[PDB]
Design a protein around this nucleic acid. Structure first.
Lengths: 115, 123, 45, 50
RNA sequence: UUAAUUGGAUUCAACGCCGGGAACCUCACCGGGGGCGACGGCAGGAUGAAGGCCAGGCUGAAGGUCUUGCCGGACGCGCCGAG
């Protein structure tokens, strides 16, 4: 099973955002306290509608600093790293970390022969 | 050349010339509404004080509604023989089939006269 | 002019009159709602 | 859409009066001038070398 | 090496230099999208925008795009010179 601060996925789901943020780190809880931008709220509306089934579009996004919430668990979204919208899937274990951590913005750096 | 169906009275030539003069003077120092949907809006809005309509309008529908609507709203109307003349008096290259005056400006003395000469045309 | 019909002496308007700006304001006939294209004011049917 | 976002903060909040460079801008009492621009304007500004 | 580590700077006289402050910006690099060619000639013109307008499918996304339904009353699409 999955555990986070003593609460599972649904145990996290049933509660409002206040204690749900109290379970989050300072960098996440404080940012949630200071509110979400107009495009974060729009994307949240999009994903809530998609989970309901209204928004059937494959959802792409660019908000890299979007903090994953338990409500977003079980959905696939495409996040922008600068070139393309790389696909990611949200499992219960994604809670408490930003979305922009999950897209390689720099490709792998390997080494060829020196000049 | 039979007059179209929406005609209710015969406008003499001098009266048509005076109507075109009023249109020109209202264009200079007043306000006119070029186009017929704008004329219809003015008559509905009540801002139209005199509706000048061309006689040689190939589509009848555009000018068909003007006489009964104007008579309903008690806004006088007059005719001019050529839509080209109405457009030239309207200061626009394309032809204006109907022009409703809002502020006669210095044409009021003509318009009030023309309205008088309109009032005798329906009798 | 196309939105203006005439029957038996009265003028019928295809679209309704938006009450904010008075007469002469045709506004959306969407079937489900009467929406105004000038400011987004929507009176649902 | 065709307007740059307002910026009260950071380097982008300051664009020099004369040369318009976005980098070094001294604002001591609000000169609002670039560093490279200060050489042509200092002596007329009453500055004196000592 | 990358999409990008923008580029410049070559020993003295390049390398805590431009940067005397890169999370948007900085951007001069990359991916993607939107928008106007001023002023003229040719052309349309009031025959009705080019500005915005909801519900939405494409749009990261926005009447940008399109089905939808429309006004605001007026000069503004576009090719060449020239911007």
């Amino acid at each position: 099973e999955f555990r986070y601060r003593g609460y599972t996925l649904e145990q996290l789901m049933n509660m409002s955002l206040e204690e749900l943020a109290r379970l989050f780190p300072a960098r996440q809880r404080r940012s949630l306290k200071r509110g979400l931008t107009p495009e974060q709220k729009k994307l949240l509306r999009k994903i809530r509608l998609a989970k309901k089934g209204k928004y059937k579009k494959p959802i792409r996004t660019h908000c890299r600093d979007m903090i994953i919430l338990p409500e977003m668990v079980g959905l696939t979204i495409y996040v922008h790293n600068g070139k393309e919208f790389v696909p990611v899937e949200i499992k219960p274990e994604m809670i408490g970390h930003y979305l922009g951590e999950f897209a390689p913005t720099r490709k792998k750096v390997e080494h060829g022969a020196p000049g | 050349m039979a007059k179209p169906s929406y005609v209710k009275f015969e406008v003499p030539k001098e009266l048509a010339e005076k109507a075109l003069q009023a249109v020109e003077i209202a264009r200079d120092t007043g306000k006119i509404r070029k186009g017929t949907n704008e004329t219809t809006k003015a008559v509905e809005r009540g801002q139209a004080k005199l509706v000048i309509i061309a006689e040689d309008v190939d589509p009848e529908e555009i000018v068909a509604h003007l006489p009964p609507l104007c008579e309903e709203k008690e806004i006088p109307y007059i005719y001019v023989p050529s839509k080209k003349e109405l457009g030239a008096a309207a200061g626009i290259e394309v032809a204006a089939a109907s022009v409703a005056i809002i502020e006669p400006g210095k044409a009021r003395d003509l318009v009030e006269e023309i309205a008088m000469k309109v009032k005798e045309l329906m009798k | 002019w196309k939105l203006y019909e005439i029957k038996d002496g009265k003028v019928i308007r295809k679209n309704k009159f938006c009450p904010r700006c008075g007469p002469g304001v045709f506004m959306a006939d969407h079937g489900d709602r009467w929406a105004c294209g000038k400011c987004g004011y929507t009176e649902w049917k | 859409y065709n307007k740059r976002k307002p910026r009260k903060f950071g380097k982008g909040a300051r664009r020099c009066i004369r040369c318009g460079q976005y980098g070094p801008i001294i604002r001591i009492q609000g000169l609002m001038l670039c560093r490279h621009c200060f050489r042509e304007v200092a002596p007329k500004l009453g500055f004196r070398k000592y």
